[PDB]
């Protein structure tokens, strides 16, 4: 408790003396209280023009038009520890996995030169803007660096100081960017050797993008099986117990002198204790602590995230196979089958799943997972939607089955091969186009995020009608030769300025290992669309009035964003459709 916890919170209590108070009426529980101090202030989702002007039968479309205007009693719940069989399987299973990652990688520190490539080209490290400004300044300053590295040398005696969360089914925690950096040169090897590639972690699918995961899920689904399952876990990060805390600080048993004790500091200090500011309207700052939960670098979370969850679900598949009879206690000779079960199988289970983070596709040997439930449920990682024992409903084919916010169509190009293409509700993806996060965009910049999107829609959903319409659109209306941005940078091979049918064989044929026959496309009209049905299903306005009116005068909507940017250099990129072409 207050030992490891009360450094840091001493040092706040002194920069904030004129204001400190225990307030008898504060709100939580389950949050360990401290005190609060006076502040007063806060970014709100800002439309983005260029998309909107170019997608007008959409301005009367309310699951589009809702999405751009606008539980905290939830991360104030407490989980229960597991039973000692769950505490068994899990620590055993924890053991084979860091294991089996590590078979062919070598932990390793990230460093200073590679910290500062991040900042110098926008990876969403999640900092706070203050002795300084924006990232990039603080990196350039040697002061920084010697507040770093004060830090640094307290976690190599095992005490903390500056490192403290900043709360703000969403719970985003921004840490100051000095701890960040020692977050990321701990443990940041997880994401940037890739610790959880699909080659590396047969479960994982880190830096697959878009375009891979359905071809992903159908050869799962070419597994001899039941059902494929996908259960929606109820607010993962919240369900993060102290035993999940400490199998994940069992990567340490990996590493070595400097590193072993820097990443035995972040474990200890920051993630199996935590400090925490939040506002409160009544308006103050309340100082927090927990021993559990997950508040991490956004990164390190998804890769602990996957590694948790791959657990749990060999576990789960473990209970289905009847590799153990009850969670209350395990035999000794149940964990030499359990043991011996990991090794003589557990790498072509791992093969069976799918794991993104909190996102699973699980498709077990047969149809008894449906129903196993103690050891998941024990665990803490209760289902969303549906009752604490009603058994899991699962998917009979693997084009149904949602991963990662989508489903996943097999399309048979004019030429017989094979297209497995990702896709959503158009009206999500039209919706999350029409939106921009923040404030200062010029035209050139709103322009230069809509053509992002539209690349995006061109790579990605080429096949919806609506959207390669609104991609050509979007594209002819903004200058040739500007660049696509975004702010908050998978796999993002649509950022570039490079031929859009170049980059499609690229991806979709060249480096396809899907696709045999390596034959390039010469033009979009040989690249199919869904059938007019399954568009129209997938969220499609072909057939309306209002969507012809608008591809019929298509041009007149180009021209008049063409008029507000000015007179630069433009491409029509209509006449890539058939119906445009004469
Ligand atoms: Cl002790 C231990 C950890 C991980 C994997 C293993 N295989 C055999 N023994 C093992
Ligand atoms: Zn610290
Ligand atoms: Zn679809």
Redesign the pocket.
Known sequence: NLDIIGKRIEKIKQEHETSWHYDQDHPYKTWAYHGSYETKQTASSMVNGVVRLLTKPWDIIPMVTQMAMTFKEKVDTRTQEPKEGTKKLMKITA??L???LGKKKTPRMCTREEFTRKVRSNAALGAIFNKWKSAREAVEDSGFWELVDKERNLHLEGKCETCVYNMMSRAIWYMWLGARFLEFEALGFLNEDHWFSRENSLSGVEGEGLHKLGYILRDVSKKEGGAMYADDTAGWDTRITLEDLKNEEMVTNHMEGEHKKLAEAIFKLTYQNKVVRVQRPTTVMDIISRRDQRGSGQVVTYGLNTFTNMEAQLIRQMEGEGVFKSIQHLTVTEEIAV?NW??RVGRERLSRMAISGDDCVVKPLDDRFASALTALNDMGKVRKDIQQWEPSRGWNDWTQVPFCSHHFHELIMKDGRVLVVPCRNQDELIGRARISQGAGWSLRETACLGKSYAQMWSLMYFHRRDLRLAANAICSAVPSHWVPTSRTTATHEWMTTEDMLTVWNRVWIQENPWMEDKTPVESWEEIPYLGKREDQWCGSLIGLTSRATWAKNIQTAINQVRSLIGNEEYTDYMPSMKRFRR
């Open positions: 053991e084979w860091w294991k089996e043991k990991l090794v």
